Amino acid sequence: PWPEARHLLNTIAKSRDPMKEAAMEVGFYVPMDYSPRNEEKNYQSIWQNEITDSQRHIYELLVQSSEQFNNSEATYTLSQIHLWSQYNFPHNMTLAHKYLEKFNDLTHFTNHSAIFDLAVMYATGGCPQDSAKALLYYQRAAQLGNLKAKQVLAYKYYSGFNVPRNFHKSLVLYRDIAEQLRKSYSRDEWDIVFPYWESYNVRISDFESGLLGKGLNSVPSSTVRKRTTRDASERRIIRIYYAALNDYKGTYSQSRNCERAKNLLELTYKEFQPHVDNLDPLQVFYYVRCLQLLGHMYFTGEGSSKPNIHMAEEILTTSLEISRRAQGPIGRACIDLGLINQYITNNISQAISYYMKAMKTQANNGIVEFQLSKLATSFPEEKIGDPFNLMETAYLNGFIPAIYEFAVMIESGNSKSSVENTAYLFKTFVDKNEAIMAPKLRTAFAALINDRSEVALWAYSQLAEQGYETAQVSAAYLMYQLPYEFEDPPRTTDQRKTLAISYYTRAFKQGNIDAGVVAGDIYFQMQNYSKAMALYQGAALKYSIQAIWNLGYMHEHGLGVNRDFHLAKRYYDQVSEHDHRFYLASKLSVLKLHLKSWLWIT
Amino acid sequence: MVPENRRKQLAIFVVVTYLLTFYCVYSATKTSVSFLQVTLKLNEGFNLMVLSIFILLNSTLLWQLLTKLLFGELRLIEHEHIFERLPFTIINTLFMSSLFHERYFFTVAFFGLLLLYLKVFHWILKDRLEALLQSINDSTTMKTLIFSRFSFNLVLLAVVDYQIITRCISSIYTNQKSDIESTSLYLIQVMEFTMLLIDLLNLFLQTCLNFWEFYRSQQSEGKFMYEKAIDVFTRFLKTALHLSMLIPFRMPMMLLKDVVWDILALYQSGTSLWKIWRNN
């Protein structure tokens, strides 16, 4: 019956991602607490009222096929259905476990995707957690040749979580994965132009107020792109350019749509070219910016079939001519022209001149120094900077291939070639390519903005183990939030909190600060008072306001340390000294302190 | 004083302010996590102004009760006087406030309201002394304890302003910072409270004059001469301090106003000096 099963499943379009369908022409709800009885009753109601009869027939056929015969291909499919909540079916975390276990029993440790998922489910203890079985499964899935498994093992060896600290093993694993990733790219994608994949590496709960309060948190918000923005004659070109931009680099709610931008740019160029001379005061800026954007879109070839190299060159040199007078910007135009005449045409000196004019611009990230270093390596008689220095500046700026090239270069020669710096470089590369190792962030966000919340928690828990800090703090926020004042605390089970604490702690040790304060609050609610002050002090040494004030509050009460009012006043004067706007609260707290002291009457 | 409709208006004002502040506090609380955030929310503009209104109301009520305790009840002449004299001083104090911007917004208001209350106290004190002189009762000698009560009022206000000025001079001396405008602010406080102290000194010497007059008159030149002499003495001290302080600061307006009214007071002092020459 499985052939008929596949033929039927061919017509349901597994998962709809509103980030993509909203590109033809807000936020989400997160929950606060959890209860298994409510969830299973919701599951029963969904199966009772929503599902259509054809889907009933399909699911019954699937159960019969995967139960009667050891089909080994209906089990996997039904497990994926119940796990990623595809084909309009609801989420179950125990039955997916059952079916993945059956599949692993069948295929005798030959399939590594199911082994990876099972190791995750055995390490997070969703279903008790047992680290040894999960580690064995990680090893096994690393042997078979999975990348993410090698990455999670390398990270687990690099941070000291769950195993002792060790830098050489992490170095070896990171070198292996960096080599594979370098060999997974073509020559044109590496040398000429890097592909543009939309990143969803943001942490959730930055669209909302924030973590541990607004205007109170230390680490700045990380939402790099969300709807950039800034009377009849003037505003038209502004609106048209901003529509072009907002449809070139897609946003979070709506992904990119490039053909629209191509049409719009060619239309506005053909319409505005005859009479450009009248737009001197301000509009020449935005017009030449649009012109450069369209030239770049032609040179790369996005939104079209193939690149138009010669037309792009003419368009860009026209843009640069228009820019010469009225002193417009030359960044992207010079960058692209240099990229062209160095490889497409065989005149190198012009490319050198272009790059040298482009180095000091703001628009470049790392391309200029990268090409300069490669050429200087190929032609030592140019007298153009120093290869190590150029690759160094490139790596520092943030260009991806430069990270790997600089790691290789610093490993080839001493130049402070310790194990820590090299491990850090390779980890930076592996983490920051993000196009193969972290594709599940897209899926997580998609499933999250269509009311399926648990599957988002699952995807984020899967991405936590690899070391993607933002995914860690996101899964944490979805498992436990900070409750508003004078309100009952959440009602989540104990395992939920004891996992959220680990995720918070690893997020903190990764570099984030606010996770320290929030984990301290989790312990404070859990009535520990012992391991809380530890994190509190560890964060206070990094100058956190709420951390310091809360440490004061902890001291001046009977919990933990015993009633040392002096150190309390010390910490309150500290929080008043470091930052300003907390003046009133510091003073009022010292006043309460004085009042307690005097009420001496007894 | 207080008309009936004014009293009901004030009761309405009090209850409205209390309700507004309670609502604002509960609002800024229920939408916050920790004390720091609700503080940053109370400091917000609307809630800031509402809390400042509450503070002003409670401070006026506190000062009213303090007055009722200290000076009992005021005579109608005193109330007419104070109601007449308030506005010019209120404008002068607002002008002192407008000298410094957002940096010194609140502490200036603190010291200004303190100065206002102390000036009201000094004026009602002078009027009470003048009443005591009119209402003198020669049935008994001016016993040590009656002068003791009056001088209790005097030394109360004396030690108050003296503590204030000495603490302010100490704050000036310890704060040799780049924040020179704070030193100028403290100098304004010194000018005001020292003016009050010199007024108290004037009143002290005049009441000792009357005490010695009663002393000799019961036991055993015109007093007008000595009264006017003390007047000139205290006005001269005023002028000297005003010069010696405001010339360093080179104030555009307080300097000119103060010294102009001081030279007019010196015109009056020269006329009284001619009275003395006629009484010589």
Swiss-Prot record, chain A:
GO CC annotation, single: Hrd1p ubiquitin ligase ERAD-M complex
Residues with glycosylation annotation: 70, 92, 111, 347, 528
Primary residence: endoplasmic reticulum
Keyword line: Endoplasmic reticulum, Glycoprotein, Membrane, Repeat, Signal, Transmembrane, Transmembrane helix
Compartments where located: Endoplasmic reticulum membrane
UniProt topology in membrane: Single-pass membrane protein
Sel1-like-type repeats, residues: 72-108, 112-146, 147-182, 331-363, 469-512, 513-544, 545-580
Domain of life: Eukaryota
GO biological process, one term: negative regulation of protein autoubiquitination
Known function: Component of the endoplasmic reticulum quality control (ERQC) system involved in ubiquitin-dependent degradation of misfolded endoplasmic reticulum proteins. Component of the HRD1 ubiquitin ligase complex, which is part of the ERAD-L and ERAD-M pathways responsible for the rapid degradation of soluble lumenal and membrane proteins with misfolded lumenal domains (ERAD-L), or ER-membrane proteins with misfolded transmembrane domains (ERAD-M). ERAD-L substrates are ubiquitinated through HRD1 in conjunction with the E2 ubiquitin-conjugating enzymes UBC1 and UBC7-CUE1.
Subunit relationships: Component of the HRD1 ubiquitin ligase complex which contains the E3 ligase HRD1, its cofactors HRD3, USA1 and DER1, substrate recruiting factor YOS9 and CDC48-binding protein UBX2. Within the complex, interacts directly with HRD1 and YOS9 (via N-terminus). In ERAD-L, HRD3 and YOS9 jointly bind misfolded glycoproteins in the endoplasmic reticulum (ER) lumen.
Protein family per UniProt: Belongs to the sel-1 family.
Protein name (record): ERAD-associated E3 ubiquitin-protein ligase component HRD3
Native source species: Saccharomyces cerevisiae (strain ATCC 204508 / S288c)
Gene name per UniProt: HRD3
Range of the intact protein held here: 26 to 686 of 833
UniProtKB/Swiss-Prot annotation, chain B:
GO biological process, one term: protein autoubiquitination
A GO-annotated cellular component: Hrd1p ubiquitin ligase complex
Catalytic reaction annotation: S-ubiquitinyl-[E2 ubiquitin-conjugating enzyme]-L-cysteine + [acceptor protein]-L-lysine = [E2 ubiquitin-conjugating enzyme]-L-cysteine + N(6)-ubiquitinyl-[acceptor protein]-L-lysine
Residue intervals on the Lumenal side: 31-43, 102-103, 170-183, 249-252
Protein location: Endoplasmic reticulum membrane
Listed EC numbers: 2.3.2.27
Molecular function terms from GO: identical protein binding; ubiquitin protein ligase activity; ubiquitin-protein transferase activity; zinc ion binding
Coiled-coil ranges (or none): none
Positions on the Cytoplasmic side per record topology: 1-8, 72-84, 127-147
Membrane spanning residue stretches: 9-30, 44-71, 85-101, 104-126, 148-169, 184-208, 228-248, 253-270
Associated pathway: Protein modification; protein ubiquitination
Keyword match Transmembrane: yes
Phenotypic consequence of gene deletion: Impaired degradation of proteins with misfolded intramembrane or lumenal domains.
Keywords: Endoplasmic reticulum, Membrane, Metal-binding, Transferase, Transmembrane, Transmembrane helix, Ubl conjugation pathway, Zinc, Zinc-finger
Membrane topology summary: Multi-pass membrane protein
Assembly with partners or alone: Monomer. Has also been shown to form homodimers. However, dimer assembly is likely to be non-physiological. Forms homooligomers in a USA1-dependent manner. However, can function as a monomer in ERAD-L so the role of USA1-dependent oligomerization remains unclear. Component of the HRD1 ubiquitin ligase complex which contains the E3 ligase HRD1, its cofactors HRD3, USA1 and DER1, substrate recruiting factor YOS9 and CDC48-binding protein UBX2. Within the complex, interacts directly with HRD3 and USA1 and indirectly with DER1.
Family: Belongs to the HRD1 family.
Function: E3 ubiquitin-protein ligase which accepts ubiquitin specifically from endoplasmic reticulum-associated UBC1 and UBC7 E2 ligases, and transfers it to substrates promoting their degradation. Mediates the degradation of endoplasmic reticulum proteins (ERQC), also called ER-associated degradation (ERAD). Component of the HRD1 ubiquitin ligase complex, which is part of the ERAD-L and ERAD-M pathways responsible for the rapid degradation of soluble lumenal and membrane proteins with misfolded lumenal domains (ERAD-L), or ER-membrane proteins with misfolded transmembrane domains (ERAD-M).
Record's miscellaneous remark: Present with 2660 molecules/cell in log phase SD medium.
Protein name: ERAD-associated E3 ubiquitin-protein ligase HRD1
Organism in which the protein naturally occurs: Saccharomyces cerevisiae (strain ATCC 204508 / S288c) (Baker's yeast)
Gene that this polypeptide is encoded by: HRD1
Segment of the intact protein contained: 1 to 324 of 551
